[PDB]
Short mmCIF file of C-alpha atoms and ligand atoms in Angstrom, two decimals:
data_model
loop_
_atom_site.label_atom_id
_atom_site.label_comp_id
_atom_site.label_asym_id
_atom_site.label_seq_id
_atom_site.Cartn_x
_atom_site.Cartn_y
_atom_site.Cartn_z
CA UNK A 1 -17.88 14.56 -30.40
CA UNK A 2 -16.97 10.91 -29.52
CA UNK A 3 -14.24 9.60 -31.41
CA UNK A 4 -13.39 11.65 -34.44
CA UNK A 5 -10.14 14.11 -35.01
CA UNK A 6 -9.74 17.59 -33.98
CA UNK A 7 -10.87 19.90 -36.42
CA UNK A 8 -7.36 20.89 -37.77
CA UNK A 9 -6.33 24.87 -39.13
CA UNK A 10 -8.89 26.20 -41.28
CA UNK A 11 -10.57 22.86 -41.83
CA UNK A 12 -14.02 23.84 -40.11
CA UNK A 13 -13.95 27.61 -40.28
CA UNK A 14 -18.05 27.46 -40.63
CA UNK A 15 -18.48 26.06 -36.76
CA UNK A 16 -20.13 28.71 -34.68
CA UNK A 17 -20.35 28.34 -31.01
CA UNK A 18 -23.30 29.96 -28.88
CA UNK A 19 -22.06 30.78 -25.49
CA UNK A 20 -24.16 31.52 -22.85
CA UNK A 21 -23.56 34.72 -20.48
CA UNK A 22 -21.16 32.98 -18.65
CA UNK A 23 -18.98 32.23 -21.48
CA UNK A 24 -19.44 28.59 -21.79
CA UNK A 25 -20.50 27.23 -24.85
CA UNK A 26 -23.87 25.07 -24.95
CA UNK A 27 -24.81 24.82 -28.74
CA UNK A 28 -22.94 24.91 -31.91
CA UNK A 29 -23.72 26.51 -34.95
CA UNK A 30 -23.20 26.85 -39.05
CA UNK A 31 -21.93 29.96 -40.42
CA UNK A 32 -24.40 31.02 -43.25
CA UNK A 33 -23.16 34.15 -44.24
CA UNK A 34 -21.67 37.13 -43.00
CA UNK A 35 -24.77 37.99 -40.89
CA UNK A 36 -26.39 34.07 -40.75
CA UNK A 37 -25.86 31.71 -37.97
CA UNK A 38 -27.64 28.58 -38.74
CA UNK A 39 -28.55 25.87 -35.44
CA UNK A 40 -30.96 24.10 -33.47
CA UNK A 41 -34.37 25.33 -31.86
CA UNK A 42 -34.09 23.30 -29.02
CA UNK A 43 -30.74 25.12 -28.11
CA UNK A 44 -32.72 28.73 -27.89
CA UNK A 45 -33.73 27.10 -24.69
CA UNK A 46 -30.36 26.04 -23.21
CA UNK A 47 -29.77 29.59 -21.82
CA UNK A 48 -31.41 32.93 -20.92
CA UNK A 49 -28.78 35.02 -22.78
CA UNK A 50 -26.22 33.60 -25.27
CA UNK A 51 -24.11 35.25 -28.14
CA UNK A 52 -22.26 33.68 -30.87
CA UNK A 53 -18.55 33.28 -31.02
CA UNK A 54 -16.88 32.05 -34.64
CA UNK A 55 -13.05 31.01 -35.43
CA UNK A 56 -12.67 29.43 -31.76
CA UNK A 57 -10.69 25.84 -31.95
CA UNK A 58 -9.81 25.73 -27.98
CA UNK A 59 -11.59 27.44 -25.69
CA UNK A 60 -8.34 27.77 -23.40
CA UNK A 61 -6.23 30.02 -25.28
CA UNK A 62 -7.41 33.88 -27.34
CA UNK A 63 -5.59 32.50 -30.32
CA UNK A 64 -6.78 35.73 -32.23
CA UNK A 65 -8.55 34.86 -35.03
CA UNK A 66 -11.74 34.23 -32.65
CA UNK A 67 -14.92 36.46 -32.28
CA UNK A 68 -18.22 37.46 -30.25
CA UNK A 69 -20.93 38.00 -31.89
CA UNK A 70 -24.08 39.64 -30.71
CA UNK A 71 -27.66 38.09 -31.54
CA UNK A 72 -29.96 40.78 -33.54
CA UNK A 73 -32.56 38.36 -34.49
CA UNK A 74 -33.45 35.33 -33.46
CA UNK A 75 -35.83 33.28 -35.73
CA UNK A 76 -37.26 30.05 -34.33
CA UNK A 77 -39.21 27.35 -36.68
CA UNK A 78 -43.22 28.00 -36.16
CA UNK A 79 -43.69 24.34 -35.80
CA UNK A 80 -41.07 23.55 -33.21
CA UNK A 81 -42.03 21.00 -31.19
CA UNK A 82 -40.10 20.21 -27.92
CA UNK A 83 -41.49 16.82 -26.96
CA UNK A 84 -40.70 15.32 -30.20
CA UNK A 85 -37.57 17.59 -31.37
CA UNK A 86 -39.39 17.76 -34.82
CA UNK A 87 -38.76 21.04 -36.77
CA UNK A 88 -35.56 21.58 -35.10
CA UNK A 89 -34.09 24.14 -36.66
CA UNK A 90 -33.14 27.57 -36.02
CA UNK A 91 -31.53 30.97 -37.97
CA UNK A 92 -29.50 34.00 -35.86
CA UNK A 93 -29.55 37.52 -37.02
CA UNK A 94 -26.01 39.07 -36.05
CA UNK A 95 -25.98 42.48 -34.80
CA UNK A 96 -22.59 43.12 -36.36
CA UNK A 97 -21.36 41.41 -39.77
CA UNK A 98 -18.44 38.12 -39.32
CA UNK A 99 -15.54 39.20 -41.02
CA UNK A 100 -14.45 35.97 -42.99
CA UNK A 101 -10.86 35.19 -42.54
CA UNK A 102 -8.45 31.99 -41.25
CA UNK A 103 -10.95 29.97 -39.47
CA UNK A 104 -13.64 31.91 -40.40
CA UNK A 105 -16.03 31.31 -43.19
CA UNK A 106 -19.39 30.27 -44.32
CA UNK A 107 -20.74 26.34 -45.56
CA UNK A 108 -22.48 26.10 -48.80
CA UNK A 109 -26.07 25.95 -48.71
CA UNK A 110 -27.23 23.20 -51.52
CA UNK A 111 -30.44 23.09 -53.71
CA UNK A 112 -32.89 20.78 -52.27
CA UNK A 113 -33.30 18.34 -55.30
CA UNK A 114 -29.47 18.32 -55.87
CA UNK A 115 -28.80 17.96 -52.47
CA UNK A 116 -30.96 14.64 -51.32
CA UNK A 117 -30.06 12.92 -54.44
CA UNK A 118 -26.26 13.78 -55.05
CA UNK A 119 -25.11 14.88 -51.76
CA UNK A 120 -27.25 12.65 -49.22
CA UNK A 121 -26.65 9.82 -51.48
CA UNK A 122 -22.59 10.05 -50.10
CA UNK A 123 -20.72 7.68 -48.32
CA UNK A 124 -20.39 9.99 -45.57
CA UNK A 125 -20.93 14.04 -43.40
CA UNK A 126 -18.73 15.60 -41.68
CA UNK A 127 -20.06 16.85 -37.53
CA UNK A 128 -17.83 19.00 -35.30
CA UNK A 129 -18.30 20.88 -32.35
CA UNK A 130 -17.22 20.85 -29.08
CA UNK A 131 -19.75 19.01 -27.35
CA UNK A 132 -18.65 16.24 -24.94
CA UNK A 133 -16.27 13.55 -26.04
CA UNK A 134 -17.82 10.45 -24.31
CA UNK A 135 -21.76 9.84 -23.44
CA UNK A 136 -20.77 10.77 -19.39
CA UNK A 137 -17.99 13.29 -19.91
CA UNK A 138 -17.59 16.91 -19.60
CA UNK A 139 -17.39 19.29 -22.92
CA UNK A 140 -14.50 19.93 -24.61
CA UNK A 141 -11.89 22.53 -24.96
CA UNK A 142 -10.86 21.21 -28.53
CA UNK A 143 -13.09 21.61 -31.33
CA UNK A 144 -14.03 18.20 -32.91
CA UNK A 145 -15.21 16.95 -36.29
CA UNK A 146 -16.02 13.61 -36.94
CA UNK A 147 -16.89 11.18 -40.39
CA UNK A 148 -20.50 10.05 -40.16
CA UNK A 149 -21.85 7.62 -42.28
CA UNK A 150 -25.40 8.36 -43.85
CA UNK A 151 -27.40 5.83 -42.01
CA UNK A 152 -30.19 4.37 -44.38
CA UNK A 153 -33.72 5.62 -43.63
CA UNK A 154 -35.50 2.32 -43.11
CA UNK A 155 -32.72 0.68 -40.72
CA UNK A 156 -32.88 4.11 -38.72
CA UNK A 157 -36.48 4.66 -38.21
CA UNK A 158 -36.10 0.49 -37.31
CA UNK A 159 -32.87 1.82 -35.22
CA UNK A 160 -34.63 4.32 -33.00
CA UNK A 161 -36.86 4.03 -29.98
CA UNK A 162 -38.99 7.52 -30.96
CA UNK A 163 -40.36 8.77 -34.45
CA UNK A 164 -38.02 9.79 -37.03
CA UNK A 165 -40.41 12.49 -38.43
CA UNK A 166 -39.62 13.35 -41.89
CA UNK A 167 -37.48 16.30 -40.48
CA UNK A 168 -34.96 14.45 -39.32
CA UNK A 169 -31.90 11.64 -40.80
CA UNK A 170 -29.45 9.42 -39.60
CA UNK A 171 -25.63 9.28 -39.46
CA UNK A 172 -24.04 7.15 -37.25
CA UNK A 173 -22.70 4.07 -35.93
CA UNK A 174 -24.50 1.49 -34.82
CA UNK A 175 -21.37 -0.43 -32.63
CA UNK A 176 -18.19 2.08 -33.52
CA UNK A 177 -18.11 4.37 -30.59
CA UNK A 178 -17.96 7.33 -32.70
CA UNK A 179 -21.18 10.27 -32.69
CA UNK A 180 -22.26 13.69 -32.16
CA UNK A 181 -23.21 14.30 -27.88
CA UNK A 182 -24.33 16.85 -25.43
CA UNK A 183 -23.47 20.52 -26.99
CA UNK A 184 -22.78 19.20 -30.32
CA UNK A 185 -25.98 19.94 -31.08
CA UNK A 186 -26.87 23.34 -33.42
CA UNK A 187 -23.66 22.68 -34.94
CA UNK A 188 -23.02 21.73 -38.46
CA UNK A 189 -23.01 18.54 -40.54
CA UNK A 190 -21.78 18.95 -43.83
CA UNK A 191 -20.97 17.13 -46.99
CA UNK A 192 -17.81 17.34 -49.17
CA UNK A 193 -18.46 17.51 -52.62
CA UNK A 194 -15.42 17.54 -54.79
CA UNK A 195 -13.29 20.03 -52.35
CA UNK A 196 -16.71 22.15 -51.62
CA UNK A 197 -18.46 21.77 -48.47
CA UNK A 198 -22.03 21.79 -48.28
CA UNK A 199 -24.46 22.39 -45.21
CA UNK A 200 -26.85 18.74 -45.35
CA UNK A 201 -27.85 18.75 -42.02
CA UNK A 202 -27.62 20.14 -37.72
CA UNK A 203 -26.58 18.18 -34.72
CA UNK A 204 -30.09 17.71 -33.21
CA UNK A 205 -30.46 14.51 -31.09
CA UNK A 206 -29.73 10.87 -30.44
CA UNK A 207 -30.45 8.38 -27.47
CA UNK A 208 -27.26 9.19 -25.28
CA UNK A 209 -24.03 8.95 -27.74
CA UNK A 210 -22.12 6.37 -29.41
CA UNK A 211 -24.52 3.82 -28.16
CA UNK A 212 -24.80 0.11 -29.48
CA UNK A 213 -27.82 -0.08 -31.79
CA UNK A 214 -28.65 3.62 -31.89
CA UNK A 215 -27.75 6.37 -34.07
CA UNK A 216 -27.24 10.76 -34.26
CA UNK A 217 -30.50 12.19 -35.57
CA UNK A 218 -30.01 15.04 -37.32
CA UNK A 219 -32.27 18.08 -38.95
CA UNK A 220 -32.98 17.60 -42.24
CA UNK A 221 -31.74 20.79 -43.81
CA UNK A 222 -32.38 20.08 -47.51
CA UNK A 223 -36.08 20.10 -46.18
CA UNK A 224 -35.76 23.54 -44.77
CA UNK A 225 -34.13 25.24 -47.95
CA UNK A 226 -37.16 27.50 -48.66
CA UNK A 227 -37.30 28.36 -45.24
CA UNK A 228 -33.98 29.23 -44.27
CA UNK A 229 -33.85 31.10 -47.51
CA UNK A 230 -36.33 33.16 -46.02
CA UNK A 231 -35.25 33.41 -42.38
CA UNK A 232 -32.35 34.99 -44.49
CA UNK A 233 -34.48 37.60 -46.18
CA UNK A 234 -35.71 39.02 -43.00
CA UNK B 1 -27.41 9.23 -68.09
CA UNK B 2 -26.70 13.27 -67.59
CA UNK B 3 -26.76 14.44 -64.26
CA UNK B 4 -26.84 10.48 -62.67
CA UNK B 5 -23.46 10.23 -64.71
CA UNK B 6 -20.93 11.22 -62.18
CA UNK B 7 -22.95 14.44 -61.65
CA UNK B 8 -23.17 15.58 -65.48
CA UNK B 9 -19.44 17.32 -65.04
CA UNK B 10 -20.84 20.15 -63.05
CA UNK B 11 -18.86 21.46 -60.06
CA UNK B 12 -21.65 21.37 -58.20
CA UNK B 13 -25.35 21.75 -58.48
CA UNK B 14 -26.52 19.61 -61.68
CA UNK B 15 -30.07 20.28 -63.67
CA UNK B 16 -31.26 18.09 -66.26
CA UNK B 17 -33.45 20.54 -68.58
CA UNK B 18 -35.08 19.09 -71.91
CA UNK B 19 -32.69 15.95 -71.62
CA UNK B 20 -29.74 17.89 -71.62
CA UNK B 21 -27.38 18.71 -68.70
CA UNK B 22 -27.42 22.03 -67.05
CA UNK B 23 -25.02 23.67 -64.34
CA UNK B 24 -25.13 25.89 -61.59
CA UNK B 25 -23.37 27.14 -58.76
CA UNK B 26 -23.91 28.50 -55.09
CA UNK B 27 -23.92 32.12 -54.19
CA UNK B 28 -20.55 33.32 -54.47
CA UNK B 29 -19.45 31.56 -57.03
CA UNK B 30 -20.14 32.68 -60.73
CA UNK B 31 -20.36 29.44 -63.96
CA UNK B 32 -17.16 29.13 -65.47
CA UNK B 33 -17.11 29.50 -69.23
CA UNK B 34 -16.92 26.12 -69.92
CA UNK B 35 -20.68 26.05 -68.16
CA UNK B 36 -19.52 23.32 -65.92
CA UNK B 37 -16.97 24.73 -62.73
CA UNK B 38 -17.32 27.27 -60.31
CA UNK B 39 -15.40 30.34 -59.92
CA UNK B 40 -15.48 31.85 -56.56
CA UNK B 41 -16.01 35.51 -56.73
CA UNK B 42 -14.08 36.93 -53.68
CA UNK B 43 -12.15 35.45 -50.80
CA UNK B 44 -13.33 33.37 -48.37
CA UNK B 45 -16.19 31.20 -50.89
CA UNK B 46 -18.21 29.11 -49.11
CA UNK B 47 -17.55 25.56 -48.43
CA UNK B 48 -13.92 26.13 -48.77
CA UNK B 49 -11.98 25.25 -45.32
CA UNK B 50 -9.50 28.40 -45.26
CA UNK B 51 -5.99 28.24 -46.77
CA UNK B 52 -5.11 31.65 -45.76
C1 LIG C 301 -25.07 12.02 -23.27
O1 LIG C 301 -26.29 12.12 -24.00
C2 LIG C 301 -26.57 13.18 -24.81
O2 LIG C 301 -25.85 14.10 -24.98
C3 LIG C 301 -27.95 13.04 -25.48
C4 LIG C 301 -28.28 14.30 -26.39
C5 LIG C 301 -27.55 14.36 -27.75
C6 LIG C 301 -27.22 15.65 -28.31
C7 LIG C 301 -26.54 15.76 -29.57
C8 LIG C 301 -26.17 14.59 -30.30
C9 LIG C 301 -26.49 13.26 -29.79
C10 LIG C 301 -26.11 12.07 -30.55
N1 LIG C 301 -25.92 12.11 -31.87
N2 LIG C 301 -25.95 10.90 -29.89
C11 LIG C 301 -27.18 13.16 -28.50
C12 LIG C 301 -29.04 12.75 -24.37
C13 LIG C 301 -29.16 13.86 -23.30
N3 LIG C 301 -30.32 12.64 -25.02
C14 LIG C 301 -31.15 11.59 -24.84
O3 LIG C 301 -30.86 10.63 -24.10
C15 LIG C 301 -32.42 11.69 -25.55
C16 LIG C 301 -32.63 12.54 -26.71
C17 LIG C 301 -33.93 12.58 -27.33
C18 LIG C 301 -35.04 11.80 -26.84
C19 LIG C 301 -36.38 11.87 -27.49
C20 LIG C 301 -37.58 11.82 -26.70
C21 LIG C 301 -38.84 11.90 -27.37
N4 LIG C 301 -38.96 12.03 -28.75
O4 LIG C 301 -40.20 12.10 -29.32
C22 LIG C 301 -37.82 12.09 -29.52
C23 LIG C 301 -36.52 12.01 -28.92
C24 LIG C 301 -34.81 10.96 -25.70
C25 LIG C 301 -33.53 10.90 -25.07
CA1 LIG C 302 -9.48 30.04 -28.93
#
């Protein structure tokens, strides 16, 4: 995350984080529910083995309330399509259940109709993760979350140098060096409605980070509803 | 008018059915009796950043 606060106690206790089998994280993720982890396709291919770790804030200190989890099931969208990022979206079967507790608990996941006109319709999303914190820097240690803006549809797809397939939406700045970045991606984007978080969309892409004229493209999720309802069933 | 009208009262997810307002909530949470909030039903609801 560029810009943005640190994700305070308890405030983003649905932020997963795959780790790779060197125990560095690469991807983020949304807690679905106790055996759910919801991300991004094109992270299934940042790393030959990775598990899923939930409750981590700094990756320099065990506070405690962290945990591994082992990947059961891994299901990947049919249509996923590298070159373009289109269908980018993911679900993870956990071997073993996540135990919800301090730090530790699942997002909302809307109704579709409800969801693109009430919740989409927001001000702003909320992204965290602990991707990098500036377009050339390393990760970071500290989990992140940030306030994005919904970027309108027409000034993004005008915004953006590639196709914004109907998969994808904007949040952003288009000069405030604030945005998702390198191993945000996977993670969550969520919208607060009346003290209840909801899961709206997942860190997917964007033409470097915080860049002048460019915004974060993220996975529609409202799109995906049916879907990951099934992924979920299986 | 109904659910364009500050999200017809509802907690959260807002139906309009036959011109009239109807509420609903995600799983975990149960419709209060007033048919409008949301009651979680255990610890740990989603959407809620942790308190304890
Ligand atoms: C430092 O830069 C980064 O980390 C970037 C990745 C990235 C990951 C997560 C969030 C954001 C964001 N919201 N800015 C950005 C960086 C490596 N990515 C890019 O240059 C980049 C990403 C997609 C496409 C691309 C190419 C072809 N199609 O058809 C669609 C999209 C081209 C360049
Ligand atoms: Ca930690």
């Amino acid at each position: 995350i560029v810009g943005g606060q640190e994700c305070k106690d308890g405030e983003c206790p649905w932020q997963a984080l795959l780790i790779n089998e060197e125990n560095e994280g690469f991807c983020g993720g949304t807690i679905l529910s106790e055996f759910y982890i919801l991300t991004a396709a094109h992270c299934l291919y940042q790393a030959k083995r990775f598990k899923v770790r939930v409750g981590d804030r700094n990756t320099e200190q065990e506070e405690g309330g962290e945990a591994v989890h082992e990947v059961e099931v891994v299901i990947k969208h049919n249509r996923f399509t590298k070159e373009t990022y289109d269908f980018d979206i993911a679900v993870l079967r956990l071997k073993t259940p996540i135990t919800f507790r301090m730090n530790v608990a699942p997002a909302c996941l809307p109704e579709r109709d409800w969801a693109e006109s009430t919740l989409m319709t927001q001000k702003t999303g909320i992204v965290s993760g602990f991707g990098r914190t500036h377009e050339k820097g390393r990760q970071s240690t500290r989990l992140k979350m940030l306030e994005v803006p919904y970027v309108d549809r027409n000034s993004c797809k005008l915004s953006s140098s590639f196709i914004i397939t109907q998969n994808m939406f904007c949040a952003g700045y288009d000069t405030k060096q604030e945005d998702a970045c390198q191993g945000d991606s996977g993670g969550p984007h969520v919208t607060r409605f009346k003290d209840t978080y909801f899961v709206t969309g997942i860190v997917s892409w964007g033409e470097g980070c915080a860049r002048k004229g460019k915004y974060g493209i993220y996975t529609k999720v409202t799109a995906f509803l049916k879907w990951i309802d099934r992924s979920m069933k299986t | 008018k109904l659910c364009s009208l500050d999200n017809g009262d509802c907690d959260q997810f807002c139906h309009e059915e036959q011109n009239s307002v109807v509420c609903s909530c995600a799983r975990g949470y149960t419709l209060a009796d007033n048919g409008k909030a949301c009651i979680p039903t255990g610890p740990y609801p989603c959407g809620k950043q942790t308190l304890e």
